RNA sequence: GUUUAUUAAAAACACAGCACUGUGCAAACACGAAAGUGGACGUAUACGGUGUGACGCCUGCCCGGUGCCGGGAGGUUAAU
C-alpha cells in the first residue's frame, strides 16, 4: 500500500475538535487496513505569514500507509469541511518514527 | 368598478385642457386602496377598498359608524 | 456526439445532428405525462401577442420535478429520456420507496448513479441541497429564487451558476449571463453543470427544421409598407431611420430594466 | 390625531394624555393591539373615573404576570442535543419552534412568538445567550446550551 | 418553398447561418382603462427585436452630425 505524510491545520477555536477529528479520520483509515504510524499532533504554533485574517492555526500530522480509495475520499473530507485549512498529502518511501 | 365604499366616490370625467385649450376627455380616478380595518365589534379585520378621504372619515367617525352606514345602504363589508 | 451529415440532397449540406447514444429508445413514462396544447402565439383576446410561433410537431408535456421535495431519501437515476420542452434531457429517478419522478439531468449523470435531495446529503454532482450548506465556489444548477419556489435559474443545457459569496443570510451568485445577484441561502440547488452542453453545436440545416420546431418566418421590417412597420417604404431599400420595434420603441441598445422591486437583489449588471 | 393612551408607549405615551400621534400610527399599531384609544371630547368622560383609577392596575396585573410568568422558571436553561453533521454544520437551524415546544414542555408555558433570538436562529452547536420578551420594560434570559449528538 | 384570388410568380418575401441589442423571471415585449392571458407550464445553450442572408476568402478609416449609453460636478428648470 502507499505511505503518505498528512500534515493539515485546524482553526484554533475549533482546536478542541482535534482529537475527535484525529480519531474519526484514523478510524476511517482503519476500515481500509491502513496501518497508522505517526500521530505527532504539533499543537498551536505561530504561523509565518497571515493565513486568513487570524494567524496561529493548529497543526496535525498523521502519516499513514493506506490504499487509494480511502486517501482520496479522506482528502475530500479535508476540502468540504470548515475546520481544516490547507491540508496536504505527500510521498511514500517507507514510514514511521519519532521525529520533528 | 372603482367605487370607494365609504364616500361613494367614482371616477368623474372631464376635459384635459392643454396649453392652447385643446380639450381631450380624461377620466379623474379616485385614490383607492385596499385597506384592512380592525373592528372590535367583530374583533377582527374587515377589509375595505376605500378612498383616502374615506380613511379620513374613518379617522373622524368610528369604524362602526361607517360599517353602520353600510349596514344602512346594505352593501357588504 | 456531434454528427456532421452528408450532402445527399441540398439542404443536407449544412446539417449537424447531436446523436446521443445514451438516451432512451422507447416511449416515455406515462404516469408523469400529459398533453400540451399549443397556442400559436395567442391569448384570451385571441390575438397574436407574441409573434412567430405556430405549427410544429405535437409534443406532450412531462411533469418534471424542480423543487426536489423527497427530502432524505436515496434515488437511483434509471434512464435518460429526451424531453421536447427543454434544451436538456430528463432523467427518470427511482426513489427507494418506489416513487418515480423526472429530474433535469446534470453533466455526469449516467444511469444507475445514486442522487439524493435534502439538507443531509453529499456534495456529489446531482444532489439537491440548500445554499447555506453548499460550499462557496461550488457550481450549482436548477437554482431557486424564493425558498420552496422550485427552481428558476440555470436550468437549460450546459447552463450553470457559480456560488460566489455568502453574505450573512444571502448568497451572491454569478449567473450564466454574468450578472451577480443575491438569493436567500435557504434555497435548494442541484450540483454540477447541466448536461447536454453540446446543444450549442446544432445547426438545423434547412427551413423545415425551424418550422417544425415551432418557429414561423420572421419578416424584416424593411420589406413592409410604412403603415405596417415603423421602418418600411422607400423605393429601392431606403432605410434612413433609427432602428426600432414594430411598436416604435427603440431597439438595438436601449435598456428596459425598470422594476425597482427587484433592484435589492442585484449586485452587478450584465456587461 | 389627538389620541389618549393605555400602554406606556416608550417615547411619549404616558397613560391617559392628549398625544399627537400620526394618522397611520394611531390606526395600524395602537388600535388593533389595543394600546391606545382615539379620544376626542367623549371618551374622556368615560375615562375619568371608570377607566383612570379602576382599570389601570386591572391592566397592570398583566404587567405583574411578566414578573410572575417570567419567574415560573428560576432554573433558566435549555438543552438542545440535535443531530449534528460530520463534525459541524448542524442539521437544522432553530427558530422560534424548538425552543417554544421545549420550554412549553419543560419550563414556562409561553406562546411561540415570544421566542427572541439575538445570535441568529441557532446554527452552530454550543452555548447561546438567548433572551425573551414578556414586557416592554422586563427582559428575561434563558441560556440555551446546544449539544452535539 | 412563398407571393399581388381576378393583367405582375420575379432579381421580390422567407430560409438555414452570422452579428448587434434588450430581457434575472411577478422577464422584456405584446393584447387588455382593469383583473388577467400570451411569452413558456420556458428560465440566458432561453426568449423578444432589428439588419444581413447558405458556403468560401473577408468585413478598412471617421464619434464632428442625428441616436443610444455611462457620468455626475457646474449652470438653467415644474408643481411646491
Curated annotation (Swiss-Prot), chain A:
| UniProt KW keywords | Acetylation, Ribonucleoprotein, Ribosomal protein, RNA-binding, rRNA-binding
Post-translational modification (record): 5 different forms of the protein, varying only in the number of C-terminal glutamate residues, were isolated. The sequence shown is form bS6-6, which is the longest. The first two Glu are encoded by the rpsF gene, the other Glu are added post-translationally by the RimK enzyme.
Q: Spell out the GO cellular component terms annotated for this protein, sorted alphabetically and separated by semicolons.
A: cytoplasm; cytosol; cytosolic small ribosomal subunit
Q: Which residues carry this modification: N6-acetyllysine?
A: 93
- Which terms does the UniProt entry file under GO BP? cytoplasmic translation
Single Gene Ontology MF annotation: small ribosomal subunit rRNA binding
Subunit record text: Part of the 30S ribosomal subunit. Interacts weakly with uL2 in one of the 3.5 A resolved structures.
Family named by the database record: Belongs to the bacterial ribosomal protein bS6 family.
Function field: Binds together with bS18 to 16S ribosomal RNA.
Indicate what this protein is called per its UniProt record.
Answer: Small ribosomal subunit protein bS6
Q: Which organism is it from?
A: Escherichia coli (strain K12)
- Annotated gene: rpsF
From Swiss-Prot, chain B:
Naturally occurring in which organism (per UniProt): Escherichia coli (strain K12)
NCBIfam families reported in the protein's UniProt record = L28
Q: Does the keyword Ribonucleoprotein apply?
A: yes
* BP GO annotations: cytoplasmic translation; ribosomal large subunit assembly
Q: Which GO terms describe its molecular function?
A: rRNA binding; structural constituent of ribosome
Q: Name one GO cellular component term.
A: cytoplasm
Question: What's the protein here called?
Answer: Large ribosomal subunit protein bL28
A single Pfam family, by name?
Ribosomal_L28
> Can you tell me where the transmembrane regions are?
none
- This protein's UniProt keywords: Ribonucleoprotein, Ribosomal protein, RNA-binding, rRNA-binding
Report the domain of life of the source organism.
Bacteria
Q: Which family does it belong to?
A: Belongs to the bacterial ribosomal protein bL28 family.
Q: Relate the assembly described in the record.
A: Part of the 50S ribosomal subunit.
Curated annotation (Swiss-Prot), chain C:
Spell out which residues are annotated as carrying N6-acetyllysine: 241
Sorted alphabetically, the Gene Ontology cellular component annotations on this record are:
cytoplasm; cytosol; cytosolic large ribosomal subunit; DnaA-L2 complex
For this UniProt record, the keywords arranged alphabetically read as follows: Acetylation, Ribonucleoprotein, Ribosomal protein, RNA-binding, rRNA-binding
Q: Using the UniProt annotation, give all residue ranges assigned to the region (Disordered).
A: 27-52, 220-271
Q: Which SUPFAM superfamilies match?
A: Nucleic acid-binding proteins, Translation proteins SH3-like domain
One of the GO BP terms on file: negative regulation of DNA-templated DNA replication initiation
An annotated Gene Ontology molecular function:
rRNA binding
Pfam families for this protein: Ribosomal_L2, Ribosomal_L2_C
Q: Does the keyword Electron transport apply?
A: no
Q: How does it assemble?
A: Part of the 50S ribosomal subunit. Forms a bridge to the 30S subunit in the 70S ribosome, contacting the 16S rRNA. Interacts weakly with S6 in one of the 3.5 A resolved structures. In pull-down experiments interacts with CedA.
Q: Which NCBIfam families match?
A: rplB_bact (TIGR01171)
Please tell me what else the database record remarks about this protein. This protein can be partially replaced in vivo by its H.marismortui (HmaL2) or human (L8, from the 60S cytoplasmic ribosome) homolog.
According to its UniProt entry, the function of this protein is described as: One of the primary rRNA binding proteins. Located near the base of the L1 stalk, it is probably also mobile. Required for association of the 30S and 50S subunits to form the 70S ribosome, for tRNA binding and peptide bond formation. It has been suggested to have peptidyltransferase activity; this is highly controversial.
By sequence similarity, the record places it as follows:
Belongs to the universal ribosomal protein uL2 family.
Identification of the protein by name:
Large ribosomal subunit protein uL2
Tell me what gene encodes this: rplB
Curated annotation (Swiss-Prot), chain D:
List every position bearing N6-acetyllysine: 89
Q: Which GO terms describe its biological process?
A: cytoplasmic translation
Question: What Gene3D superfamilies does this protein map onto?
Answer: Ribosomal protein L9, C-terminal domain, Ribosomal protein L9, N-terminal domain
Keyword terms: Acetylation, Ribonucleoprotein, Ribosomal protein, RNA-binding, rRNA-binding
N6-succinyllysine: modified positions: 71, 83, 112
The record, for HAMAP family, names: Ribosomal_bL9 (MF_00503)
Similarity remark = Belongs to the bacterial ribosomal protein bL9 family.
Q: Which PANTHER family match?
A: 50S RIBOSOMAL PROTEIN L9 (PTHR21368)
Q: How does it assemble?
A: Part of the 50S ribosomal subunit. In stalled/collided disomes (pairs of ribosomes where the leading ribosome is stalled and a second ribosome has collided with it) bL9 in the collided ribosome contacts bS6 and uL2, while it contacts only helices of the 16S rRNA in the stalled ribosome; the inter-ribosome bridge thus formed is different from that formed between normally translating ribosomes.
Function summary: One of the primary rRNA binding proteins, it binds very close to the 3' end of the 23S rRNA.
Q: What is this protein called?
A: Large ribosomal subunit protein bL9
Per the UniProt record, the source organism is Escherichia coli (strain K12)
What is the primary gene name for this protein? rplI
